[PDB]
TrEMBL record, chain A:
It comes from Maribacter polysiphoniae. Mg(2+) 2 binds at N430, I469. The keyword Metal-binding applies. This is Piwi domain-containing protein. One of its GO terms (molecular function) is nucleic acid binding.
TrEMBL record, chain B:
NAD(+) 2 binds at Y4, N15. The chain holds residues 102 to 201 of 452 of the full protein. This is TIR domain-containing protein. NAD(+) 3 binds at Y4, L14, A16. NAD(+) 1 binds at L14, N15, A16. It comes from the Bacteria.
Length: 469, 100
RNA sequence: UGACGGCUCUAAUCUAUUAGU
DNA sequence: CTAATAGATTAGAGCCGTCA
């Protein structure tokens, strides 16, 4: 008969200085934080892509409802929420003839055709950027379904260009980093799901009951990619820096050459949540080893500390290094050798390969979210997925599987660690959801590491997320 | 920032609805009071005014303190033998016997 | 690549023993 | 160093559901 402890929801902040718990309700009651004036858009694609994009933009100017208004709060229209103008008047079409797209996608070599498609698109986008007086904020790339399907490494067709990826998305996002154009990739079947069907007269992607959720997430992503700040945290304390750390294999290379990346979150003393990547890919030449060398470990820690210091002027009082791996001793000693005296380094391992499933005795509903089972002073379980009593449902479908959290190195309180981890799940600007199942410091670092791995021609890449997500 | 004393004397004795900590539970109290005191609401928009009325009164839902008991998929081992033994078959078993 | 969750299938790398060193 | 026995520990890819 072990005991469970429950942790309250952290709450997120909005305009008027108003704190709520759900992002959707807090965008439809007080609106976003910063004040833009409108989003001018660029569209690259075929004529049908412009048609579909115009249709969707015109559609989402009116309120959209869902089937269930408790589980999924309504969408009251784009301008009624975001206090800005985004219609089919500030568009700038760049027609791409279907002849070239069809001609390229028949070469039977995935890398070659991926390279050709990415070059074809980015040449037009860069030419539009540099040599014209038009100001366009978010470049929307409408891509046909067949291009998306046939752009995988394990795809089938029914040396100079081999140092790349086989994916349209990763190469496209990597090759435009040095020019910094915020782009958004759409599929044709996503914006117009009615037309794209199967041999049954019904759409393949059925959004009939969840149109409002699709509008919410698309509008939120567009608002964030255009210099918008929709919400921020509420009670993340001063003097604390949160760091992520993820390892990515570079795959196509002579050496195994594991790479590593990071993310940084903290408070800027102006109540703003500074949140950006701190990445210059550090490489481990050893196969299968997921540990930094002392040199690169020192370099990474020094870069993070210097960024924090130049941001605020004072070194952090507490530092948290989150990861999915376990540090060895040399890595942590290298960490410690370049650390100031008035600063605490704490490392945490967040794992998901640990089977512990709890079942309610009577009902047909799963366990509450905030429940946590403390094992030791340095080990616990946390349920980031579970029943939320405000939306009358859960975040998953089957019985969920909790995160296993251990304080690997340092001295701290496990309750505060779980509280901060739960608070770090309300920052998924890529989505509009109640909360995340894993902390955001470990998911955006993953996206950065996946983006800046397909290319090897990149130096000093930017830190803002708007060019990766 | 203003205390009880500084309140206008003509209004301090009246029941007041509080917006200090949020504007949403204050609106919940407003709707409760209005529907209790029979204010003439003329619903002109259907399926919209009701949904907005429902969005408040549910944003503030939370958990209740009731004892709960859960099962799991862990079975606790009860008993163990008292001796782990290392027997010594010095070249007394085949070198490639495949003990398993 | 509009999100998220749950599964399944695959390579790796360490640590302890044994024979080819 | 390479060939097997395990326990413990990380990544990469692909598929399906979301409703009432
Ligand atoms: Mg995105």
């Amino acid at each position: 008969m072990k005991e469970l402890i429950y942790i309250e929801e952290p709450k997120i902040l909005f305009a008027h200085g108003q704190k709520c718990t759900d992002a959707r309700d807090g965008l439809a009651l007080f609106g976003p934080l910063n004040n833009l004036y409108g989003i001018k858009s660029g569209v690259i694609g075929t004529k049908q892509g412009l048609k579909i994009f115009r249709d969707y933009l015109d559609h989402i100017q009116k309120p959209i409802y869902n089937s269930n208004s408790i589980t999924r709060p309504m969408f009251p229209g784009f301008e009624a929420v975001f206090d800005c103008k985004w219609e089919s008047t500030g568009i700038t079409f760049k027609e791409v003839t279907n002849e070239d797209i069809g001609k390229f996608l028949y070469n039977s070599s995935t890398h070659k055709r991926t390279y050709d498609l990415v070059s074809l698109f980015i040449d037009k986008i860069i030419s539009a950027n540099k040599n014209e007086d038009e100001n366009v904020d978010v470049w929307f790339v409408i891509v046909p379904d067949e291009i998306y399907k046939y752009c995988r490494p394990n795809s089938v067709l029914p040396a100079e260009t081999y140092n790349y990826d086989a994916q349209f998305h990763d190469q496209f996002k990597a090759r435009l980093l040095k020019h910094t154009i915020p782009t958004q990739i759409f599929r044709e079947s996503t914006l117009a799901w009615r037309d794209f069907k199967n041999a049954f007269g019904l759409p393949i992607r059925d959004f009939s009951k969840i149109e409002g959720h699709l509008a919410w997430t698309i509008s939120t992503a567009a608002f964030y990619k255009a210099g918008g700040k929709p919400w921020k945290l509420s009670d993340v304390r001063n003097g604390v820096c949160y760091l992520g750390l993820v390892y990515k294999k570079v795959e196509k290379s002579k050496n195994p050459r594991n790479a590593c990346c990071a993310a940084q979150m903290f408070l800027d003393n102006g109540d703003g949540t500074v949140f950006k990547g701190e990445v210059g890919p550090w490489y481990n030449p050893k196969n299968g080893q997921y540990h930094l060398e002392p040199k690169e470990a020192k370099a990474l820690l020094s870069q993070s500390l210097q960024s924090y210091k130049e941001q605020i002027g004072e070194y952090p009082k507490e530092v948290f290094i989150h990861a999915k791996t376990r540090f060895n001793h040399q890595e942590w000693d290298a960490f410690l050798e370049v650390t100031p005296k008035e600063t605490n380094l704490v490392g945490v391992t967040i794992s998901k390969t640990k089977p512990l499933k709890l079942y309610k005795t009577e009902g047909d509903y799963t366990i509450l979210r905030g429940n946590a089972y403390v094992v030791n002073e340095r080990s616990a379980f946390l349920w980031t997925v579970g029943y939320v009593p405000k939306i009358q449902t859960a975040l998953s479908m089957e019985v969920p599987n909790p995160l296993f959290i251990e304080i690997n190195k340092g001295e701290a309180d496990i309750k505060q660690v779980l509280k901060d981890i739960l608070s770090l799940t309300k920052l998924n600007y890529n989505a509009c959801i109640f909360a995340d199942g894993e902390p955001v410091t470990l998911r955006f670092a993953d996206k950065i590491g996946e983006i800046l791995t397909a290319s090897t021609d990149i130096k000093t890449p930017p830190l803002a997320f708007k060019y990766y997500i | 920032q203003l205390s009880y004393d500084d309140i206008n004397i003509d209004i301090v004795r009246l029941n007041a609805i509080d917006f200090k900590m949020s504007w949403a539970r204050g609106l919940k109290d407003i709707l409760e009071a209005f529907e209790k005191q029979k204010v003439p609401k003329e619903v002109a928009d259907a399926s919209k005014s009701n949904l907005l009325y429902q969005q408040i009164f549910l944003h503030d839902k939370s958990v209740i303190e009731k004892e709960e008991i859960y099962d799991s998929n862990w079975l606790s081992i009860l008993s163990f033998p008292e001796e782990l033994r290392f027997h010594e078959y010095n070249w007394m078993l085949p070198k490639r016997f495949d003990v398993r």
